[PDB]
Amino acid sequence: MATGDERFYAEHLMPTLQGLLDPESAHRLAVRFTSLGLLPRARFQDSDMLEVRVLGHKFRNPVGIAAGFDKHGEAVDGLYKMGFGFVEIGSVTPKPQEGNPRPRVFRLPEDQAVINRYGFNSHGLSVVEHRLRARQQKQAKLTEDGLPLGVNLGKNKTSVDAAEDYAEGVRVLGPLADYLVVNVSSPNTAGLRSLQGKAELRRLLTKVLQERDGLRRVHRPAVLVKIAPDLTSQDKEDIASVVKELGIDGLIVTNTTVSRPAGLQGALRSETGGLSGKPLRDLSTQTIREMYALTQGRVPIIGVGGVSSGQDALEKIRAGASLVQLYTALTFWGPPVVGKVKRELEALLKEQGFGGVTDAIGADHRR
Ligand SMILES: Cc1cc2nc3c(=O)[nH]c(=O)nc-3n(C[C@H](O)[C@H](O)[C@H](O)COP(=O)(O)O)c2cc1C
Ligand SMILES: O=C(O)c1[nH]c(=O)[nH]c(=O)c1CCc1ccc(-c2ccccc2)cc1
Ligand SMILES: CCCCCCCCCC[N+](C)(C)[O-]
Ligand SMILES: CCCCCCCCCC[N+](C)(C)[O-]
Ligand SMILES: CCCCCCCCCC[N+](C)(C)[O-]
Ligand SMILES: CCCCCCCCCC[N+](C)(C)[O-]
Ligand SMILES: CCCCCCCCCC[N+](C)(C)[O-]
Ligand SMILES: CCCCCCCCCC[N+](C)(C)[O-]
Ligand SMILES: O=C(O)c1cc(=O)[nH]c(=O)[nH]1
Ligand SMILES: [Cl-]
């Protein structure tokens, strides 16, 4: 196949919207529309070849919405409707906070990229908890039906105890989540990425895991750590070592990059913030590949960064990802991108002689 809506969105609707509205306004409107289920028809029907079992769950397809689109858990059901196999909300911080001053998001159209410096704009734990609670049973059913929910946790700008911020998040939202993410890789909170270093991480993660283990069984989420694409080889080794020592459930690979790859064309390339989309794609993929190897393929990875096609998804899966996420591609191609990626991925799995996604995970390593 290959669709009318895909072409219409790509060639007319999205460019027109970007023309009318700055990126943060467009994002806010998109959250609203999605929250109301005002979406183009998602014709694609997930086949069994797309199902994955990981992280204590069944995932009907392996394509999720990355953190940052639904920061505050306002559009979860709309996102499933859009065809994502799983939804991750957040980052959520303990107390509400405004984030950085505007403008703080920038398009690089020539690069199929975005740069953001939101700074964990967040409604806070309390608000989000209540919002999730209002739909908790409906989510339990969705999760049973292979449509899990992740919650990504951040820390407030003025916090004097990062580990406590994460612990508070585990206590408040963990009971509502299939998986939690310790996001220690935003580039837009001072000092945060230092939490990726070995001693800090071990201390923070031990606390987080303790908190988690203290939740009742039916409310006990998987815990993953989301890492930057900008780590040294030493940092990566250290993270793998800690994940193994502590039994962390998985990794999310990667956040945005503070690098500016050679060749960027957008006028806005030198704006401060994290860069996402196509220029991030292979950097991301390579990081997955390295982490999979460092963890002996025993630690589930959710691969993210510059996925806008089936090939992109498959490349990450073959590199070691059990699941993938996308955000920036949505910002270019709109909702039809979801079915596009899934249709393309199913075709390529068939063409490469995989019985389904599961058979492709980590395949490059076994060559
Ligand atoms: C506007 C924007 C906001 C984001 N905010 C968050 C966040 O709150 N937490 C997080 O873990 N990642 C956040 N990210 C990163 C994405 O989850 C993802 O890791 C990254 O953008 C790479 O995927 P992509 O190239 O498909 O966008 C954000 C990304 C963008 C573009
Ligand atoms: O337009 C953007 O630049 C932008 N930037 C971001 O950083 N985040 C965003 O979310 C966006 C907007 C992307 C978007 C997503 C969904 C839609 C949509 C939703 C429902 C129905 C039709 C379109 C439209 C635009
Ligand atoms: C101005 C010359 C015509 C170019 C417009 C592009 C053709 C249609 C694009 C795809 N469609 C919107 C029909 O789905
Ligand atoms: C609310 C819709 C207002 C639309 C006004 C702009 C129409 C320009 C069409 C541009 N394009 C050829 C890319 O579709
Ligand atoms: C109101 C300012 C002009 C924007 C009108 C909306 C259509 C913009 C489409 C731009 N472009 C031709 C590059 O697609
Ligand atoms: C709402 C402020 C700017 C308008 C941008 C585009 C809105 C398009 C509305 C489409 N719809 C068919 C649902 O009415
Ligand atoms: C009814 C047409 C409304 C005029 C819209 C003016 C364009 C807004 C500027 C957005 N921008 C090009 C900076 O993205
Ligand atoms: C955030 C920009 C949204 C603009 C276009 C919305 C199109 C909605 C189509 C709804 N329908 C249910 C009619 O498909
Ligand atoms: O809120 C942000 O600035 C944000 C958080 C995150 O983890 N990644 C990112 O690119 N932006
Ligand atoms: Cl420059």
**Ligand 1 atom with minimal separation from the 254 CA:** 19
Q: What angle (nearest 5°) sits at the alpha carbon of residue 154, between those of residues 252 and 219?
A: 75
Residues with Cβ within 8 Å of 219's Cβ and at least 6 positions away in sequence, in order, are 174, 175, 176
SS (H, E, C) the chain: CCCHHHHHHHHHHHHHHHHHCCHHHHHHHHHHHHHCCCCCCCCCCCCHHHCEEECCEEECCCEEECCCCCCCCCCHHHHHHCCCCEEEEEEECCCCECCCCCCCEEEEHHHCEEEECCCCCECCHHHHHHHHHCCHHHHHHHHHCCCCEEEEECCCCCCCCHHHHHHHHHHHHHHHCCEEEEECCCCCCCCHHHHHCHHHHHHHHHHHHHHHHCCCHHHCCEEEEEECCCCCHHHHHHHHHHHHHHCCCEEEECCCECCCCCCCCCCCCCCCCEEEEHHHHHHHHHHHHHHHHHCCCCCCEEEECCCCCHHHHHHHHHHCCCEEEECHHHHHHCCHHHHHHHHHHHHHHHHCCCCCHHHHCCHHHHC
Burial 259-268 (b: 16+ CB within 10 A, else e): eeeeebebeb
Structure tokens at 330: 């949505």
Residue in 122, 159, 186, 276 annotated catalytic: 186
Question: Residue written as tokens 């815990």?
Answer: 223
> Are 156 and 201 spatial neighbours (Cβ–Cβ below 8 Å)?
no
Residue 71 assigned as binding residue = yes
> Are 179 and 151 spatial neighbours (Cβ–Cβ below 8 Å)?
yes
Which residues hold their Cβ within 5 A of ligand 10, which is an ion?
A: 270
CB atoms within 10 A of CB 235: 17
Residue type, 18: Q
Alpha carbon 77 to chain centroid, angstroms:
16
* Atom 1 of ligand 9: nearest residue by CA position: 120
Per DSSP bridges, beta strands 63-65 and 323-326 are: parallel
> Are 171 and 209 spatial neighbours (Cβ–Cβ below 8 Å)?
no
Q: What angle (nearest 5°) sits at the alpha carbon of residue 23, between those of residues 191 and 269?
A: 60
Residue type, 303: G
Q: Which of 7, 13, 14, 340 to mutate to test the pocket of ligand 3 (most atoms within 8 A of CB)?
A: 7
Structure tokens at 327: 């955000």
Q: Which residues line ligand 4 (CB under 6 A)?
A: 12, 15-16
| Domains delineated in the chain | 1-367 (3.20.20.70)
Distances from the Cα of 50 to the Cα of 30, 181, 280, 317, 338, angstroms: 27, 23, 25, 12, 13
CA 12/CA 15 separation, integer angstroms? 6
CA 322/CA 6 separation, integer angstroms? 26
> Comparing C-alpha atoms, which of 34, 146, 7, 49 is closest to residue 343?
49
CA 199/CA 196 separation, integer angstroms? 9
CA 171/CA 322 separation, integer angstroms? 27
Beta bridge partners of 222: 179
Residue 183 assigned as binding residue = yes
CA 37/CA 40 separation, integer angstroms? 9
Alpha carbon 299 to chain centroid, angstroms:
17
Q: What angle (nearest 5°) sits at the alpha carbon of residue 60, between those of residues 55 and 63?
A: 80
Q: How far apart are the first and last CA of the chain?
A: 31
Beta bridge partners of 52: 59
Phi, psi of 112 (to 5 degrees): 50, 50
> Are 256 and 118 spatial neighbours (Cβ–Cβ below 8 Å)?
no
CB atoms within 10 A of CB 11: 11
* Atom 18 of ligand 2: nearest residue by CA position: 30
> Are 245 and 205 spatial neighbours (Cβ–Cβ below 8 Å)?
no
CB atoms within 10 A of CB 126: 13
Structure tokens at 352: 């490469």
Distances from the Cα of 43 to the Cα of 4, 5, 147, 343, angstroms: 12, 10, 17, 10
Structure tokens at 141: 């059913």
- Polymer length of the chain: 367
CB atoms within 10 A of CB 232: 9
Experimental method: X-ray
